[PDB]
C-alpha cells in the first residue's frame, strides 16, 4: 500500500515552442486509467504555452524554481508572481541548483517554507554526492537535508510536501544505481519522517526517485516499497515518458 | 550629435498580470515623437503577456537574465530558448546578480559574448559599491569591469552593446548620483572605449545611467554629454516612466 503516485517531468533548461507543443500533444493523447498525478515542470518562458496547451486532466504544471518575495531581484521569479499566474506546483532544491547556484540546505528550507505557506505543492529535492557516499556519509547528508526542511514546517504542512531523492553520486559519474540502493535511501527518509514527525505523515508521504529513469527500468523501480513515483530528467523530453507514467500502476 | 538614446524599464522581480497590463495600456497610449528606443524588461513569466500586449512601435521587450546554453540547468533560461521565443534584447550583469547570485566579471563577460554571438542586443551593467566609492576605487572598479567584457568581444560586436552605469549606492535608495558624478563616470567609460577600441565606436556607444532616476531628476541627468539614457527600476512600475521617456533625445 502506497499513496497516490507522481510522475514528474523536469524539462530543465530545454525546449522550443515547436518541440514542446508536440510533446504536449502526445501527452494529451495519453490514456491513463490509474490514480496518478502527472506533473510538467517547464522553463518560466514556456509556462504560458504549457498552461494553454495542456488539457489532460491528470497533468498539472510546475515551475523549476522560485524566490520567496517579489522585489529587486533582477532575473529571478517569485512565489507571488507564480501564484498570480496560476502555477501551484514547484520544484525546489534541485541538485543542479545546489551545485551551481548557491543553494544551501538553509536556502532550500526557506524556499520550501515560503512556498508551503503560500499554498504550493512542493517537490523538494535532496540527495548525496559520490564523495559523500564514498566516505560513508549518505545517512548524515540525507537526514541533514531533510531535517533542515523539517525545522521550518509544522505537521499540517507536510500534506503539501513531496520529497524527491536524487542519487547525485550516480549522475554524471560513471556509477549505476540499482533498485536496491534507491530503496535503501528511500526507506531511510521515510524512517526519519515516521520517527521525527509521525507515522501518519510518513505513510502518506510521496518519495520520488530522482535518478536515471527510462521506460525500461521504471517498473522495476516502482516495484520497490518506498518508491512513489519519479522526477524525470532526459526521458521527460521524450515519448518514453509515457511508459514512465504507466509504470506507476 | 548624441547616439540614439534608450529609456529602459527594468521591472525586476515584480508585478501582476493586471498591474502590468495597465502599464502596457498606458505605454501603448503614449505618443513619442522623438528618436528613442524604449525597452521593457519583464520577468520570464511575463514575457508572453508582454510580447502579446505591447504594441507601440518604439518599444522592445528584453529578458532580465539568461545562461548561455540549453541543458541540465534546472530553473535557468537559455539564450536559445529566448531567441526561439522572439526576444532580442537582454539585460546582463545587473548588480543584483553580481551581489547575490555569484556573477563575476568573468561570468558577466561570458554571458555578454554569448549573447552578442546569438545576435542579441545586450545592456551590460557595471557599477561600484558604496564601499568602493568611499575608498576612492571608482575608476578601478568601473574600468576593470568594462575591461572584462571587452576581452571577449570583437570590434564589430560593439554595435550590439549598451553600457549601463549603475552605482550600487544609488540602486533604489533615493541616492541619485549628481549630474556631475554621473557625467564623470560616463566620460571615464567612454575615454576607455576610444583609447582601447576606437573613437568611432566610442562616439556610437550608448551609456545609460541607472540609479534612483525619476521623472523630476531625469531631465538634468540627460543634459549631460556622456549620458545617453536610462535604466529605470522602481519608476518603471509607475506612469512616471513616461516623463522619463520624454526626458531624452
Ligand atoms: O535597474 C535598476 O537597478 C534600477 C536602476 O538601474 O534601480 P532603481 O529602482 O533605483 O531605479
Curated annotation (Swiss-Prot), chains A, B:
Matching PROSITE patterns: TIM_1, TIM_2
UniProt-listed InterPro entries: Aldolase_TIM, TIM_sf, TrioseP_Isoase_bac/euk, Triosephosphate_isomerase, Triosephosphate_isomerase_AS
Active site residues of this protein: 94 (electrophile), 166 (proton acceptor)
Intracellular or extracellular location(s): Glycosome
Isomerase in keyword set: yes
Main location: other
Domain of life: Eukaryota
Residues holding substrate: 10, 12
EC identifiers of the protein: 5.3.1.1
GO cellular component: cytoplasm; cytosol; glycosome
Catalytic activity: D-glyceraldehyde 3-phosphate = dihydroxyacetone phosphate
Pathway of action: Carbohydrate biosynthesis; gluconeogenesis; Carbohydrate degradation; glycolysis; D-glyceraldehyde 3-phosphate from glycerone phosphate: step 1/1
A molecular function (GO) term: triose-phosphate isomerase activity
Record keywords: Gluconeogenesis, Glycolysis, Glycosome, Isomerase, Peroxisome
Biological processes annotated in GO: gluconeogenesis; glyceraldehyde-3-phosphate biosynthetic process; glycerol catabolic process; glycolytic process
Family: Belongs to the triosephosphate isomerase family.
Other known facts: The enzyme contains a high proportion of positively-charged residues in beta-barrels V and VII (compared to the homologous regions in other triose isomerase sequences). Since 2 clusters of positive charges located at precise distances on the molecular surface are common to 4 glycosomal enzymes, it has been speculated that this might represent a signal for entry into glycosomes.
Assembly notes: Homodimer.
NCBIfam families the record matches: tim (TIGR00419)
Protein name from the UniProt record: Triosephosphate isomerase, glycosomal
